[PDB]
Amino acid sequence: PVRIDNPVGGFSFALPAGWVESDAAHFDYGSALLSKTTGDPPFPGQPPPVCNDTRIVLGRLDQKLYTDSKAAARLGSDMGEFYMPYPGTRINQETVSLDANGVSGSASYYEVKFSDPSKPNGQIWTGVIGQRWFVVWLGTANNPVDKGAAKALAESIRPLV
């Protein structure tokens, strides 16, 4: 169990097994971007290969932006445009209640069946917890969102004091 502090964003979280940070700059402004290692280890000290069709973003959710249920739905809709900007239809929608050590939240999940029959279906899970924090886990039919792990990641969020 690996806990990561994000002091600018005011929270800590548990790093999902098999994931690394994608860059350092997100932490400058209170966010975090994570990538999934492929499992093939790099030479020691060098950066590991990571998947290009899945990613996780988390951070403080600005008080100016966006109930946690309504917020996660709205954020999830916007995130899906930003990360999956191709025409398609939303299918297999779900909402999930969150409880991060007693701090309530909500998440919205859905899949995108793209108009392009050669594109794998997109998948997106967006959680809001709470001061408020968000978690977005993006994947595809070939590299699916791990819904149980996304819930565990959001429920691992703790405010820093």
Site for its own copies in 108-137 (CB under 8 A): 134, 136
Under rule CB under 5 A, residue 15 binds Hg ion:
no
Under rule CB under 8 A, residue 64 binds its own copies:
yes
The span from the CA of 87 to the CA of 42, in Å, is 37
Binding region for Hg ion (CB under 5 A) out of 24-32, 44-52, 64-72, 92-100: 44-52
Site for its own copies in 7-26 (CB under 8 A): 7-8, 10, 15, 20-26
Residue-level length of the chain:
161
User: Binding-site residue total for its own copies (CB under 8 A)?
Assistant: 51
From candidates 3, 89, 93, 97, binder to its own copies by CB under 8 A: 3
CB closer to its own copies out of 82 and 92: 82
25 DSSP assignment: G
From candidates 8, 14, 15, 51, binder to Hg ion by CB under 5 A: 51
Compute the half-sphere exposure of residue 117: CA atoms within 13 Å on the CB side of its CA: 0
Under rule CB under 5 A, residue 33 binds Hg ion:
no
Under rule CB under 5 A, residue 14 binds Hg ion:
no
Under rule CB under 8 A, residue 142 binds its own copies:
no
List Cα–Cα distances, 2 to 65, 87, 121, 123, 157, in angstroms.
30, 38, 31, 26, 12
**Torsion, Cα of 50, 38, 26, 125 (10° steps):** 110
The span from the CA of 89 to the CA of 114, in Å, is 6
